[PDB]
Design a protein around this ligand. Sequence first.
Ligand SMILES: [Zn+2]
Length: 323
Amino acid sequence: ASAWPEEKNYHQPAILNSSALRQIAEGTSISEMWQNDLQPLLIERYPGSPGSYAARQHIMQRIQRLQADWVLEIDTFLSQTPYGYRSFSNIISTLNPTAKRHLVLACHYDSKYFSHWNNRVFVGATDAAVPCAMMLELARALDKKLLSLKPDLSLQLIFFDGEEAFLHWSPQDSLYGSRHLAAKMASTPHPPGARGTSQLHGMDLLVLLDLIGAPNPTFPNFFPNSARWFERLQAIEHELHELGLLKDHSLEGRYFQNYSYGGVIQDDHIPFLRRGVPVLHLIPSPFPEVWHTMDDNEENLDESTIDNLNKILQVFVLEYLHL
Ligand SMILES: [Zn+2]
């Protein structure tokens, strides 16, 4: 009986030295992400809408142009909703599908439904167009390194559909894509041919990005079983800061602070967390002031903060993967 699903418990990062940290800082471009990955997603894209289709095509196209061997899968399903049966489509992008273990980065790509109000349209810039663009920029920036994966451990990106409630949050109206995918992964043997392990056993850690892009975010350390990875984000932030590789940033105003949060925040990690998957939930507390208002738009995003977080996340991912 292999103990491979226990490997994630002892897995340690391969820490980058100063020269490598400078290379990563210089290799990501916030203005390219902004133009090429983010702006095309700043559209109405509630489930089933034309915008949902356009967002999905954009995400797939941006991944398909990369050199690394990404395998794209669209996970389409039906669910009951306050408006009757509807269809949803999760996007899964995976390097080394048969690899036993994957580090998983995720966000939701749907935008919350709102009828137009005084000619304003809700585009959910921090929620979660920026997180989607950060995942696309990371895939682009680390492409040469990821190409080398073509430790049975690799990378997977999930863009969930239907994270938002069609009305206000309730247990049955929200998290459509993640409740569906967690149950599908829990009942899918992995690796192929396995007798008793599932794709969830293969998920080393689910790093879920949401509500990112406003000024002064503070991310709490939510869960004890991922606390040592939260500490790694703190260390990376601190070292990039000390190397002068972050912009408009101070340690008193750092993003990863020493403080927990005992309450529950409803998000796409919930169906995974309740099936035993370790989660690092990169959502700030408090939420951006523009949360669920028409002001969650491009104008209210903080460019240098998003840039700093791209650098921290990319370093975290290379260190976890030993790349
Ligand atoms: Zn939201």
